[PDB]
Amino acid sequence: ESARSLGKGSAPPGPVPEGSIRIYSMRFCPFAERTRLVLKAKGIRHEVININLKNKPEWFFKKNPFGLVPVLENSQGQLIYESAITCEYLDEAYPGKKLLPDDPYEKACQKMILELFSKVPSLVGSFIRSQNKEDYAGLKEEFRKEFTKLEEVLTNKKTTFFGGNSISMIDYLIWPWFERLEAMKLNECVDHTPKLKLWMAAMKEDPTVSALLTSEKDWQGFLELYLQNSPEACDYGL
């Protein structure tokens, strides 16, 4: 019940309490998962408001002019949007495990890997446009070309994760699209990328990843409603 989304007609929410940060999220949004993985990895006390992205509250555009999740709002009333900006803000503003390195070059390397990854989220988009076994063969080739680039980074570094032998920001920033691969029937696309495939196994063992992972049944329930343009897609399961 508590996780039910707010949509059109919902009262603007009150001030974020001191000692807490608020995320405007949607339970199946991969971009907002980035921000929730960081909040959990850093142990930041927070509250979640889920937004019905099919049936947005008008007041939500006061939080983010683009009308997109994720959005952070703190007790001072500051608003931060764009998933990679929300994650970096949280790593700098809060104590705990640093997810980005302090060294400028190593930090730039994490960003360059994110850049290597930057076509993957629009391919997941495009997966919607796949109607038949022919489009599905092309889609799989497109994922393979992108995954080879990430495979090369792990072969150069010979580390468990993209930022070294410990999980760091860059892993959490790319993870949500890998999480969705099995439910999209694109698991085979890591078959030519053995290190990327072991990276996925190591990610699923991470306490933070494991605490936020959605079951394939849960993601399928969402997608089917999403693809009808159902106002209930966002509240699948509730």
Q: What is the DSSP letter of 91?
A: H
Would you say 114 or 123 has its CB closer to its own copies? 114
Interface residues with ligand OR7 (CB under 6 A) are 26, 28-32, 69, 124-125, 128, 226
Phi and psi (nearest 5°) for 185?
Answer: 65, 35
- Nearest approach, Cβ of 72 to its own copies (angstroms)? 9
Tokens standing for residue 105: 């070059």
Residue closer to ligand OR7, measured from CB, 19 or 125: 125
Residues 175 and 37: their CA atoms lie apart, in Å, by 9
Which is nearest to 41 in space by CA: 7, 75, 80, 90?
A: 90
Contact 154, 199 (CB under 8 A): yes
Q: What angle do CA 165, 180, 22 make, to 5 degrees?
A: 80
Give 52 or 86: the residue with its C-beta nearer to its own copies. 86
123 touches which of ligand OR7, its own copies, none (CB within 5 to 8 A by kind)?
Answer: none
Which of 13, 67, 111, 221 binds its own copies (CB under 8 A)? It is 111
Q: Which of 8, 59, 97, 115 binds its own copies (CB under 8 A)?
A: 115
Of 13, 44, 48, 107, the residue at the interface with its own copies (CB under 8 A) is: 107
Is 29 an active-site residue? yes
Task: Using the Cα atoms of residue 53, residue 56, residue 61 and residue 63 in order, give the sign of their dihedral.
Answer: negative
Listing DSSP states for 184-207 in one string gives HT-GGGGTT-HHHHHHHHHHHHSH
CB of 165 to ligand OR7, least distance (A): 30
Q: Does 211 bind its own copies (CB under 8 A)?
A: no
List interacting residues with its own copies (CB under 8 A). 65, 78, 80-82, 85-86, 88-89, 92-93, 104-105, 107-108, 111-112, 115, 149
Binding site members for glutathione: 56, 69, 82-83
